[PDB]
Subunit: 316 residues, 4 copies
């Protein structure tokens, strides 16, 4: 998985993610309207009037397990795989806001209007992971962004870490810090045309574009993807209308997509980018295409009755 | 630019290309029906009954300048930029088949049914480039593929070279040979999950997928793109229906797309993948999407009257 | 700076290091005899019967200031530059053993006989850095090894980190955990002859030795040296005589040497491997060569009056 | 093998090379006195008054078989392994000067005084390789240099290629043109301290020296050494005394040395830099150290009876 955000010239959120894995099925655009009644698994606080929420997820019980989702005020959250590093308690902790890992995305989207707030309240949040025997424990870290900035939540054996994400991207393992240090290796990689220069008498020129970028890794491992989408996100030129910004989000995400054949998982199956979702706070619209179909489908909040009390699924 | 081909289990052609540049306009899906009357600029031979041809191009005079095109028997050709290396005579040469660079794609598509034939007749072909004062000379090399194999035509100061393209891809400079030697550097890059191993007492494991692929360059220069799409093309698992094969062609081409911001040209403008076209001999259909719109549009030969005498343009 | 440790098949110590800098500080080989009376700057406990000590360093006050040093029982220590990460208190803590930064190398060598003992004491050691007007604090981390293993001491803003050094190697910034994670990127690099493999129909073979090693970085930054000298040291075959182990130590260090012209540091001057030193416990001898002369000179402990009480510097 | 050339500010020759192999062939320093009578295996013209010659090599028949050698007037020559590319006739051509492969180093040294003259003769030279039962042809290319410049002779299936060697460096396969093209990938690598730059809001700085050099490969394959030792040799600052130039020559060569354990060749054995040699024309001295001992020993021409007539081998 990969997460990205950036802004336009007017403070609007553009946010998205690749979902990378051998196979998925059943996930759909999933709407969660203001009037839906949400009971929180460990009785965590709410907000008298909930935000409308849209994302990608599946319904289990009568709850939305979002892979990623956004609300009507420009806040968006995605969960990305993090085993080997993520680690959680299995028991609520008294007089903290106790939130179940699988509900964390709905909870953030529903109750908060900015990264400032999320960050404020995380200081007293306990992310709880409950074991179901024979079901695999979901082991995530989260990427959270609004119109101004993003943060990364990494809950680990030594405690919760909330990092200000200055490159506005996240992928998988190891820790956020490792990735931020690792970028320093690629400091010189550049988008400029490489300037003619000499080694001794030998005159060297670039054949064409891209040579100044030499040095960026191209494999699809988690650290390389981090370096490659960090670079692409940071050099993509600011855009200023919906279409160009959606196009910017998808191309950027596309820079680190996983193609079939590239890379086997620990089970000998190829990991591919199964789908790519995104969000515009400028139009309160969610977007999605898939490995099978690159056409970008839209799902405008405005098309759903945000006062109803029902979860809504759409496709396919 | 990048060119790719592969096959299915039944000998069918899948072929496509990225067109990479700062900006384009006017190019469209362009149909060339059997009954169109083609006069060859230097009176080069024909073929009593011409093949139907579809591609992407623009009309100049009443001729199709194809960037790339395919015919109704599975042969496809693309031209990709090659300045600094491509070099041509400006005068026909007596009693050779003299073909103008800009007409080479129509000529091959129209008159030949296989790479075997093209290759056979190239032995007596002269690629002629005529100067128009103040217009820039088009300086290409060509990628030519059918259901079985591809070749690369590189016309240079020292003569014409026809290479059997065993990796089934082409990008830009320098010579085909350089690229084929350069791949040897990445011999060990692998799609297997990297096997746990040790350095001294230190036990090393992969965080997840992609680590065995470490070593592939990720920049968008011409040699790196060659290595990266060669790898992706060669490890993508064989597919067996139209949809999966079209999807395979686009993802593969996508592995080396140029995103805005990544890389400036010699003029300080960003090079981007403006469009990606492709061809299926299994359905005699051409396909295309663009930087602005990833939805893949189709153009089936079957939808056009291949007996008419008119060039047809479509969009937009 | 690189530091390196390995063993023979009889459990002797081979330890050595490069000193990388712009200019010499007048350093010299330096014996610190057993009957040298030494007063510990913050009254850290000693041990009644002190070890004989040889190393490389300068004299200030009448104090021995060691870059690296080793004792008569096969324990050796090197201090390596770590600005940006290292960070120390400036005042003793009551009822900890309080050791000054610059006396740490002497302190550990004189009082301890193995890595076990040092690791044990470190649990109650406070490393204190003396402010010295308009000079800058030296900010180091430390490499400590005997005939069995290696540790790394990294005193930082958040506390003393003591790491078991499984790759037996150390360099400069960032933290030791970062380097260990980083190694994982290179887990597929091999010292085997690369075997012929195919991409589609292209048959790839190596030109010769080295191809399987492709992916190891070559620059002289701190993380690249870390990777290159870890690889080299883990893959060098065991040797069981003195000559060949000394040779192993210098060849290994040599693989990460900084050559004039390769890299400027902050001041504008080229960083260079000013000297390389190492130590053998089969023979209690310290060895050294310098940028200016690669001849390895040796300095046996047995050639110094160990019960002496003045500290000796040598040269020429 | 690496070969390297550079000059001081007075126009003297500094030339040297690594010999990389699994096992010594018993090679030695080898003087070939002016009054040594030599019969050219295919009757290549000589010159009445032959140059004094020193180098490294073996004696077979009573013939001097040089790995590399240099004459009393500052011209020097090294032969480096080139299987897979090198390729020779086995019979003299009438009215060309016909030189045997293994006598080429002696031949060029004894008869020529500068690279100009050699390049001039090469136009009428036929390099002939003698078939020697159940032994394999030695298949080399050659590195030739004086106080001004460098050439590379590559005799292949298609003819003698003689290249002006602008980077002053040579390694093994593939062809010299390939290496020169390949350098272009690394044209942005720098010996400057990398300057702070930003990706989005992330501020990137180098930990220390070396970061601007990132992108140089570190493995010991032939194309990587080519790049690494070209970089090093082009960036090493000029020196104008004998000591410092000798030091420059060995440090430069050292940056591409093959250390035990790093890379196996076809036979399963580790390839290693068995020795390194070089030559100064300020002082007509040949220098050498070996894997087993880095002490650089020197062998002045003036210490040998140059008018002698038997060829001398030295050691110890």
């Amino acid at each position: 998985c990969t997460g990205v955000r950036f802004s336009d010239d007017e403070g609007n959120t553009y946010f998205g993610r690749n979902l990378d894995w051998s196979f998925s099925y059943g996930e759909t655009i999933l709407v969660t309207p203001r009037g839906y009644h949400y009971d929180t698994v460990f009785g965590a606080g709410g907000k008298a009037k909930p935000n409308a929420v849209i994302g990608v997820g599946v319904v289990m019980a009568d709850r939305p397990m979002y892979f990623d989702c956004a609300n009507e005020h420009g806040l968006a959250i995605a969960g990305l795989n993090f085993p080997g590093y993520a680690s959680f308690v299995h028991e609520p902790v008294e007089g903290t806001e106790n939130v179940a890992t699988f509900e964390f995305p709905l909870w953030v989207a529903r109750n908060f209007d900015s990264v400032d707030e999320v960050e404020e309240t995380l200081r007293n949040v306990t992310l709880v992971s409950q074991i179901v025997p024979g079901q695999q424990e979901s082991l995530l870290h989260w990427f959270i962004g609004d119109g101004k900035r993003s943060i990364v939540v990494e809950q680990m054996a030594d405690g919760m870490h909330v990092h200000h994400d200055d490159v506005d991207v996240l992928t998988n393992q190891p820790t956020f810090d490792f990735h931020m240090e690792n970028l320093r290796n690629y400091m010189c990689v550049s988008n400029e045309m490489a300037e003619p220069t000499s080694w001794g008498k030998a005159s060297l020129t670039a054949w064409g574009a891209g040579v100044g970028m030499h040095g960026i890794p191209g494999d699809v491992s988690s650290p390389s993807r981090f370096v490659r989408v960090a670079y692409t996100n940071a050099h993509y030129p600011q855009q200023n209308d919906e279409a160009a910004n959606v196009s910017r989000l998808f191309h950027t995400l596309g820079s680190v997509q996983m193609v079939d054949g590239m890379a086997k998982m620990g089970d000998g199956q190829f990991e591919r980018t199964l789908f790519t979702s995104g969000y515009s706070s400028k139009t309160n619209t969610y977007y999605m295409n898939t490995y099978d179909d690159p056409a970008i489908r839209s799902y405008a909040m405005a098309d759903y009755d945000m006062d109803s009390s029902e979860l809504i699924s759409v496709a396919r």
